[PDB]
Amino acid sequence: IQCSQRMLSFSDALLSIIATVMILPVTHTEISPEQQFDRSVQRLLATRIAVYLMTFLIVTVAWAAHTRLFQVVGKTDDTLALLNLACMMTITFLPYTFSLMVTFPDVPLGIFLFCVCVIAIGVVQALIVGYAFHFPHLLSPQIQEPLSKERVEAFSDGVYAIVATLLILDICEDNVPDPKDVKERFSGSLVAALSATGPRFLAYFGSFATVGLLWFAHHSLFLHVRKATRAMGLLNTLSLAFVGGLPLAYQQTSAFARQPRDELERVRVSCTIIFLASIFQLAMWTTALLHQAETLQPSVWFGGREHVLMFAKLALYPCASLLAFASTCLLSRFSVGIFHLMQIAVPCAFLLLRLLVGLALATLRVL
Amino acid sequence: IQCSQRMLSFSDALLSIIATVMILPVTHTEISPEQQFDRSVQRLLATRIAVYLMTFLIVTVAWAAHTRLFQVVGKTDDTLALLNLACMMTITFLPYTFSLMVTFPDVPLGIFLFCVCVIAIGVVQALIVGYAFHFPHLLSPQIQEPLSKERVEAFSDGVYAIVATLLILDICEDNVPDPKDVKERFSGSLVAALSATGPRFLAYFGSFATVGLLWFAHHSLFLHVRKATRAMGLLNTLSLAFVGGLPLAYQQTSAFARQPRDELERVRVSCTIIFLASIFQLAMWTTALLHQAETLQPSVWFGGREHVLMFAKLALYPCASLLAFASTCLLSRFSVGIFHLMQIAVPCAFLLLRLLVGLALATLRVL
Ligand SMILES: Nc1ccnc(-c2ccccc2)c1
């Protein structure tokens, strides 16, 4: 008999790493062709984004299946650990096979490989469940559609950590100035190179800040949750999938815009991405409020002490993004500045969210 | 009052991601120049490896400092969460600053940036501890040099997951055949492209298998540990640092060798890397046996039921790597085949480790 907490955490980390692979090309796509070749570049970017979304959804489905399989198996063992490692190895091939299918649909080989991989995952799961059943003491006490809070929390943390640090990873990978390049192009001055590369640092700053605040809201929301239903899991997975686009949005926004209208469009895209990312969390919290009796703790129940605080925490980002999106069309002159100042305002509001909520209560109550 | 388990897990994931950044160039270095330019390529690879080791050690030190800081702080809050996010953001800049220092030592700016970043991390930690002290109820109950098992386990799992899936990440990133390339170069046949790219798949297979078995041994060892001392933490960090070289070793080994002696040298390098990775785990287990009374559970005590099983689990890899390294010089003709068959033999022994240990006991007892 062995505890499965560490094993399940490792499996969640592996699944989170695998799910977030196809984002890497998307962030590595050239910023601007500079030769007004927008057509092909946009088509390639759209295809990559669609492929990434599809693989993320498929890996999420596989992760949910694994979570259920190990939920019906209470305990673990060395043989079960080896079988879990094998299952993770088989699952890891899904993104590459899906990409091979998508880019080369005409050939009948990619679909064959995908079917083989799915059948292999099924076989590993069948072997795991059979081994567990052959030994009754390794099964769950009850047996021997709620989800598990720990698995969802670990997957969300892994996804958020991967998304937040992507830009810094790329910067460390490729944004190290070369000696002779600095000597010749920039008159042998490092400060010039740092100034040139600053926009990437600003984009990383913004992306990391936004992702960190979103993760903080996610953690605050999930702390006060007792039971996680399948609908909440689906909404959380959708929110995580839409979160992966934040680095791309910030890279596009921070990049120099040829014309002001291009900057307005980039800000609109970033605002839409943020709104989509946060509205799913809001919707999942409403789905939890639907039956707090079986979902939330008494503290965050209707009329609770922290009910309004949680409302504000989960509505700060959606509402602000909506106002920014509206201003992008209402004023159309300070929209870029509005987004820039909002990027610094939202963290301040989150830090002072308690005092701001108290002031809002004081002013609305006697208004 | 809020629980810090999720927050500490997220911090550990971020720190593990940051620590394992500089490995990415190392695995992305060109396999063979093909123009007998071994000098410059080898110098660049050695410099990259040294930089990676240094950054990993520095990030490990920072992670240990953070672990102590949050150990003296029992509970967390929204303000503490924001401060932790800020501290992680400041820490994330360490690898890039260290690289800037190393590549450009002559200029006095990289050292200034590194000092500024270290001072910033110190300032964030000071602010965190001051805020915690200002509110007594947020401090640890005892206050209001053992380590934490959970933090070490999470960091190890993150590092292992990152290392294992690096090769598949690269394959998905860059190893997707192009339509016209297949049409023209390979006579429009996808099977030819897959056969050409197979060596990378084999290298990923080997690396993932080895890393997974090493992680399984790590989990089995750490399950039976009550208290983790600083020496065990240092040994585990050294083992993790040396584990990061496995993908590079497997990439070099699977790559076509110009001459047989090159293949022998590559196998020697891979065997040495594996031996270094596993000997540190063995040494840390011996350091735990030093005072099992305060370190291990009674089950794995001297003369315990699982003592010999754990001995075999932790000595299978070191001993086998030592025999392979010896054979690389003794026979010098089947060394490559010896390594290839060992790669498949070791997982089988691990799977049947219980039965193999029983047979070994039966044969040694009455021998
Ligand atoms: N996608 C990742 C990358 C690195 N680490 C993790 C992780 C680590 C510990 C617990 C949960 C998740 C996830």
From Swiss-Prot, chains A, B:
Effect caused by changing N236L: Reduced potassium channel activity without affecting proton channel activity
Site, Hydrophobic filter residue 3-1: residue positions: L24
Tissue: Widely expressed.
UniProt keyword list: Endosome, Hydrogen ion transport, Ion channel, Ion transport, Lysosome, Membrane, Neurodegeneration, Parkinson disease, Parkinsonism, Phosphoprotein, Potassium, Potassium channel, Potassium transport, Transmembrane, Transmembrane helix, Transport
Entry comment, domain topic: Composed of two modules of six transmembranes, forming a homodimer with a tetrameric architecture. The six transmembrane regions of each module are tightly packed within each subunit without undergoing domain swapping. Forms a central ion-conduction pore lined by the side chains of the pore-lining helices. Conserved isoleucine residues (Ile-17 in the first module and Ile-162 in the second module) in the center of the pore serve as the gate in the closed conformation.
Protein name: Endosomal/lysosomal proton channel TMEM175
Substitution effect: M284I: Does not affect potassium channel activity
Family statement drawn from the similarity comment of this UniProt entry: Belongs to the TMEM175 family.
Gene: TMEM175
Ranges spanned by the short sequence motif RxxxFSD motif 1, renumbered to the chain: 6-12
Keyword Transport on entry: yes
Consequence when changing T229A: Reduced channel activation, probably caused by decreased interaction with AKT1
